[PDB]
Amino acid sequence: EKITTSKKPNLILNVAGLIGVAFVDMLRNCGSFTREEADEYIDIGALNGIFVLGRSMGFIGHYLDQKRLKQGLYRHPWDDISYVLPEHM
Amino acid sequence: SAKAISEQTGKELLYKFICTTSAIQNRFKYARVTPDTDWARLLQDHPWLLSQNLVVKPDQLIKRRGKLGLVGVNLTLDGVKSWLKPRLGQEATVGKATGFLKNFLIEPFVPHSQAEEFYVCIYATREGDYVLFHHEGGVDVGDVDAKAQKLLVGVDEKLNPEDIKKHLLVHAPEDKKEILASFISGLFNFYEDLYFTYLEINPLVVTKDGVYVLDLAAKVDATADYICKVKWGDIEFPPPFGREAYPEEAYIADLDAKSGASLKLTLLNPKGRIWTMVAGGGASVVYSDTICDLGGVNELANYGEYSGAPSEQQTYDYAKTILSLMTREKHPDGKILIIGGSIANFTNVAATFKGIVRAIRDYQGPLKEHEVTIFVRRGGPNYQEGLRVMGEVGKTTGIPIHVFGTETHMTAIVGMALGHRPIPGKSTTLFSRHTKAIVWGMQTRAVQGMLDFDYVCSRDEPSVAAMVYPFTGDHKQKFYWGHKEILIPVFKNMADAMRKHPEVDVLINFASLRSAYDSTMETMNYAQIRTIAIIAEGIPEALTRKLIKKADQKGVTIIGPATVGGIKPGCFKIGNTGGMLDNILASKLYRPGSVAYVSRSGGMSNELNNIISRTTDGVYEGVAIGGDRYPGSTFMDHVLRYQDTPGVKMIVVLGEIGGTEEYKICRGIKEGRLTKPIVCWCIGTCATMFSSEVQACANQASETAVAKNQALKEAGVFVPRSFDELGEIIQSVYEDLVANGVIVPAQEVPPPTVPMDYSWARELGLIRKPASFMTSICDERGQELIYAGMPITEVFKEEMGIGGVLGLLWFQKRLPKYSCQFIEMCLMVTADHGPAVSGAHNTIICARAGKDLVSSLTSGLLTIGDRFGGALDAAAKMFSKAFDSGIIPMEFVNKMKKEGKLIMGIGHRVKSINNPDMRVQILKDYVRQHFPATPLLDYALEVEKITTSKKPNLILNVAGLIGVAFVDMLRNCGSFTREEADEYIDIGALNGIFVLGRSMGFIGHYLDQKRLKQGLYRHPWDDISYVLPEHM
Amino acid sequence: DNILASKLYRPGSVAYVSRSGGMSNELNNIISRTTDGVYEGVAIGGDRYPGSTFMDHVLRYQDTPGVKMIVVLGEIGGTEEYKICRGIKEGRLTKPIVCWCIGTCATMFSSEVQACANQASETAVAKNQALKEAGVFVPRSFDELGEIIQSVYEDLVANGVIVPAQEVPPPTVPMDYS
Ligand SMILES: CC(C)(COP(=O)(O)OP(=O)(O)OC[C@H]1O[C@@H](n2cnc3c(N)ncnc32)[C@H](O)[C@@H]1OP(=O)(O)O)[C@@H](O)C(=O)NCCC(=O)NCCSC(=O)C[C@@](O)(CC(=O)O)C(=O)O
Ligand SMILES: CC(C)(COP(=O)(O)OP(=O)(O)OC[C@H]1O[C@@H](n2cnc3c(N)ncnc32)[C@H](O)[C@@H]1OP(=O)(O)O)[C@@H](O)C(=O)NCCC(=O)NCCS
Ligand SMILES: Nc1ncnc2c1ncn2[C@@H]1O[C@H](COP(=O)(O)OP(=O)(O)O)[C@@H](O)[C@H]1O
C-alpha cells in the first residue's frame, strides 16, 4: 500500500484488505494453528463467515429500522427501469 | 522537471554507480561539515582525512565560486577549523542576491597541474545529449559553449568507442586519451541509467594514480523518481541561492507532493500589499506580469498558483497558509487580495471555491483589522456559485468584495485594484467533422463531454469509437447522444480496439505518467493512428524524447504531454478541452471560426477561447501543446499546420520564458514561409525584474519574454504591450481582415440543445426529488462511519463491544455497560445447541451438499420460527402480557392451564432440582447482580416456583429467562420508554437476538462439515414411512 | 417567479401599507424596478375595521431605521388619511412619505359600491388635496407615480442617507424532478 499510495494517494489498505491480512496473520501466528490448519480455514471460507456474521447485525438493525418506521410496500419507479424487449419474438 | 542536487548526492551516486575500467580512488571520501554537528563524531567515524591535505568548499549551490574566493586550497585540519570564522554565520553576496552559509563540504586535496585538469559535461537537448570536453580546466574556461569540442548522442542509442577516440578526444595525451575513452563512456552510462539532465565535472584530473573530481554540477530529472527509487535512496533537492524558504513554504511544497495537483508558492517580501493566489500556472504568470506592468513593480509580494483540480483539502490548506501569512504585518495604506484565474477546463471551481470560502469563514478575526479588500474574477466548471455565495460570505463577514466573472477581462481586475480602471510526413489536418478516436483509460466524464460537444456541433456520429481499459473485460458502456442512449465498446486490450475499428485516426491517452509511455509506443506500432494526445503530466524527459523520436520517424503527431489537449470547433474536442458544455456554448465553440491559436497552458487556451469568441467570429482550431521541456509538437509545427490550412486566417500564439521557438516563428516569417497575420504574446516579463523565477529554465538574455516580444514585434508579428490589450489587437486584425474582404463572417445558427445530466444538475441545486427510502441506523456517506449518531472511533474508544454496537444498530440507544454485557452473554448462551436441532441439521445437510457458507447458513436459519427458535420471543410476549395485567402468578398458571396452552419458557428434559440448568444460572446471577430492577424476572421466578411443584423439571429454561430478562432490560435500563420497549418486543428484537446468536453456531457447523470432508447426504429409506394412494 | 421578478429576496429601504393584495404585488414591482427595493410591504385586508390601521404600521416603519420611505395607498371611506395628515403635521413622521388615494370615481360616477363614503370632505379627492398640502408628494393619479417615487430615491441618494448596495445573486429554488 506504500507503493500504491505512491501511485495514487487514495490507494490505501481497505478495511477488507486489512481484515484479511490481519486474520491470516492471527491464524498463522497465534500459536493455536499449524500452517496447514490456517490455510484450510482460509480456504473453506472462515473470512466469508466473519463478514456474514458481522453484517447480520447490520441487516437485522435495518429490518428493525424499517419495521419501526412503518415503511410500506416498495415498488421500483418505472423511470429507473429501461425496458428493451423484442418486437415480435 | 529538472532540479539541481548537492555535490554529496552527485558524488555518492557517481562512486556507487559508475561502471568503468578506470581506477577511481577517493571513492566514498568526503565530509559534509555543518555548524550543528559534533566534530569528534566526524573525526572519529571518518578519520581518513588526517593523512593527507584538505580542500574546503561551499555547499549551497554557488556557481563560479573560485572567483569569489570561497574555495580553500592547501589547508590543514586546524587551518580548516580556523578558516570558517570570518565567512560562516553571515551573508555572502554574489551578483545581486545574498544568503547564509551553514553547510560546507570537505575533500581530500590532490596534487595536480593544468596538464591533468580536464573539463567534461553532458547536458540534455531535444535531439539527445550534448557531451562537451574541454582541455584547459580551472577558472580560465570562460566561454564553454563555443569553445569546448562538440558531440551529440541521439535518443535511445549507445556511444561507440570511435566517437570518443577520434571525434570527442583528439586534443589530449594518448595514454590519458585511452583511459578517458572508457571513463567518459562509463560516465555517460551513469548519466543514462540514473536519469540525469546536466552533469558537469569541472575540472577533471586524470593521472596514473587515477581520476579526481573536484566540483560537480548535477541537475537530475525529478519526475523520474518513480523509476529510480532504489538508485537514489533518499535524495535531496536543495533550494537555490537566496533567502531560506519559510516553514510554510515547505508545507506548501509538501502539499504539492501529497497528490498530483499542482500547488506552487513563492515569496519575495511579506511587507507588500499586492497579494495574489490565482489558479493556473500560466494564468498566474499573466496576472503577476500585469501587476508589475502598471505600477506594481516592487509592491507585489507573493507568486503562486494551484491547478490540477485541487481537492477541498488542498485549497483548504493553501487558503489557510496564505491567510496565516496575511495577518503577520500591518500596512497603513491598506491591503488587497486579488484573485483571478482563467476559465478552468477540468479543475472543479466549486470545490476549490468552497475551500477558500470556508477558510475565510472560520478565519475572520485578524483579517478586518488589516484593511484587506478582495477583487475576485473566476470562471470554469460551476462558477455560478463561485460568484454567488462569496457575494454574501464577504458581505456578512465584513470585507469589501468585488466579484466578476467571464464577461469582464481576465486582466482588468489588476487595473481596478490600483485605481487605473474605474470599478463598474506529418499531416496538416488532424481533426475533421468525421474523425473518430479511441480513448485509453476509463474516463466516463471526459468521453461524455466529447459526445456532448459532438452533438452540439451537429456531428453525424460521435467522435469516440472505442474505449480501452485493461482492468476489465470487453463490454459496452452506456453514453448519451443528446437525449438518447448509445453504447460505446470498452476493450481490455488495444489490439482488438484497433482491429474492430479501422476508421479511428486519433488516440487520446489518459494513462498515468507510469503507463503513458508504453501505451503510446503500443499505439505508434499501429499506422492507422495519425494523432496521439497525451494527457498525463510527470513523464520524465528521456521517455518523452523516445516518444518524440518514434513519432517523428513514424509520421504521427503528438499533442505533447501535460496538456488538456486541443479543440477544433465543429469537428473534434480532446477530452476536457474547453471546459464543459456551459463554456462551449458561452464561448460559441460549437461552430468554426477564423482564428487558430497555440499555447502551452491549458487554462490559457480556454482563456484564449473566451477572448477570441468575444472579439472575433470565433476559433477555428486551438491546441495546447503542454507545459513540458520537450512537447511532442512545438509552436512552429502547429503554426505551419495552420498556415497550410486554407480555413485559418489568423494565428495567435502564447509564448513562454525560454526556448527559441518564437525565434523559429521569426525566421519563419522572415523568408516568407508564414504569410497569414500572426498575433503573438510571450508571458513571463517579470523573469528579468524579479528576484528569482522558478516557473522554462532560461539561461541567457536571449530567452526572456521581453527579448522574444521585441524580436517578434520588429519582425511582422502584432505584439501587444501586455496582456491588457491582446484582445484589442485580435479585434483590430480581425476587423482589418473583414474590411479587406478576405474573411466573410457567417451569421449565427442555433446549436442543438442537450439535456442536462441529472448528477450535474444535482451538484448545482436545480432539481428536487423525494427520497423513497428512510434509514436511521448507520450513516456512511460522510468521512467517518457513524453508528446511529456515533462515530466508529467514538464507538471503539469507550470500550463498547458486540453488545454496544448491537444496541446502537438495533435500538439507536446508548445502553449501559451491563446491558451490553448481558446482550453479549445472551449471544454466547444461544450460540449453538448441537447438530440435532432443525436449523443445525439443515445447515449440515446443505453444507454436505457442497453449497457455500451463505447458502448453508441461510438454509439453517430459515427453520427459525415458531417451533424452533421462537421460544424466546413467545416466552417474553406471554410473560409480559400476564405481568402487564394484574393477574398473580398462580392465576396466570391456572389461566394458561384452562386454555390448554403450555407456558413458553417453562420446561426442561433434565435439570429439575438441585441440578439447575447452568446457562440459566449464569444469566440469572448476572441479572441479579447488575440489573437495577427485574420485575418481570421476579414474576417469572414466582411462576417457576409454582410450576416446580407440579413437576420438578418445569424450570425457567434459557429461552424464558432470556426473554423475561431482555424485557426487563428494555423496560428498566433507562434508555427506553414503555411504548418503545413494547414496540421493540413486538417487532421481533428477540427473534434477532436468537438468530444472531445461532448464526455463529450454524457457521461453525458449516465449517466443521467442510473440514471433515463429509459427503452428500441422503436420508435412509428405512427411516421414511411411505404411505401413498393406491392409484389417486 | 414573482419574487425574483421584483427582486424580493434581499433587504431594501422602502415600506408600504395597504389593504388590497394585487396592488401590493404591483407596487412591489414598481418600487423594485424604480427604486433600490422594498424593505417591507403589507396588506391589511379591505374590511370595515382591519386588525391594524395604516398609522400603526407607519409608526412602526418610523421607529425602524431600516425604512427610509413610506408609500401609502388610500381608498374611499374612512378618515384614516386625515388622521395620518394630523400625525405628520407636528412632525411625528419625519421620513419622506408619498401617498396616493384611489377612489376619485365616487366623485364622478353614478354609483360606487367597491368604502361607504359619507361626505364630500372624506372622498378620495379631498384626501389627496389634504396630503398634497400636508407634506406628502401626491401626483394627479396612478399614472406617473414612477417619476414621483424614483425621484424621492434619487433625493435620498443625493443627501447620502441611503447607500446603494449592489445586487448579489440568490440561491435558486430547485424544480421538481418529474
Ligand atoms: C491522467 C490522470 C487521470 C491520472 O490518472 P489517474 O492516476 O488518476 O488514474 P489511474 O490510471 O487509475 O492511475 C492509478 C494507478 O493505480 C492503479 N490502481 C487503481 N486502482 C488500484 C487498485 N485497487 N489496486 C492496485 N492498483 C490500482 C491504476 O492501475 C494506476 O496504475 P498505473 O497505470 O501503473 O500508474 C490525471 O491525473 C490527469 O493527468 N488529467 C486528468 C484530466 C485532464 O485532462 N486534466 C487537464 C486539465 S488542464 C489544468 O490542469 C489547468 C487548469 O487547472 C487551469 C485552472 O484551474 O485555472 C484547468 O482547469 O484547466
Ligand atoms: C449415478 C451414480 C451416482 C450411481 O450411483 P450408484 O452407487 O450406482 O447408486 P446409488 O448412488 O443410488 O447407491 C447405490 C445403492 O444405494 C441405495 N440407496 C440409494 N438411496 C438410498 C436411501 N435413501 N436409503 C437407502 N438406500 C439407498 C440404492 O438402492 C442402491 O442400491 P444397491 O446397493 O442395491 O445398488 C453414479 O453412476 C455416478 O456418480 N454417475 C455420475 C452421473 C451422475 O452424477 N448422475 C446424477 C444422477 S441423476
Ligand atoms: N581540490 C582542489 N585542489 C586545488 N585547487 C582546487 C581544487 N578544487 C578546485 N580548485 C580550484 O578551483 C578552480 C576551478 O574551479 P572549478 O572547480 O572548475 O569551479 P568552481 O570555482 O565553481 O569550484 C581552479 O583554479 C582550482 O585552483
Swiss-Prot record, chain C:
Compartments (UniProt record): Cytoplasm, Cytosol
Post-translational modification (record): Phosphorylated by PKA and GSK3 in a sequential manner; phosphorylation results in activation of its activity.
Annotated signal peptide: none
Positions of modified residues (Phosphotyrosine): Y39
Modified residues (Phosphoserine): S20
Top-level taxon of the source organism: Eukaryota
Residues that coordinate or bind CoA: L131, K132, E133, A134, G135, V136, F137, V138, P139, R140, S141
Residue ranges that the Swiss-Prot or TrEMBL entry lists as coiled coil: none
Subunit organization: Homotetramer.
Protein family per UniProt: In the N-terminal section; belongs to the succinate/malate CoA ligase beta subunit family. In the C-terminal section; belongs to the succinate/malate CoA ligase alpha subunit family.
Primary role: Catalyzes the cleavage of citrate into oxaloacetate and acetyl-CoA, the latter serving as common substrate in multiple biochemical reactions in protein, carbohydrate and lipid metabolism.
Name listed for the protein in its UniProt record: ATP-citrate synthase
Protein's organism: Homo sapiens (Human)
Gene that produces this protein: ACLY
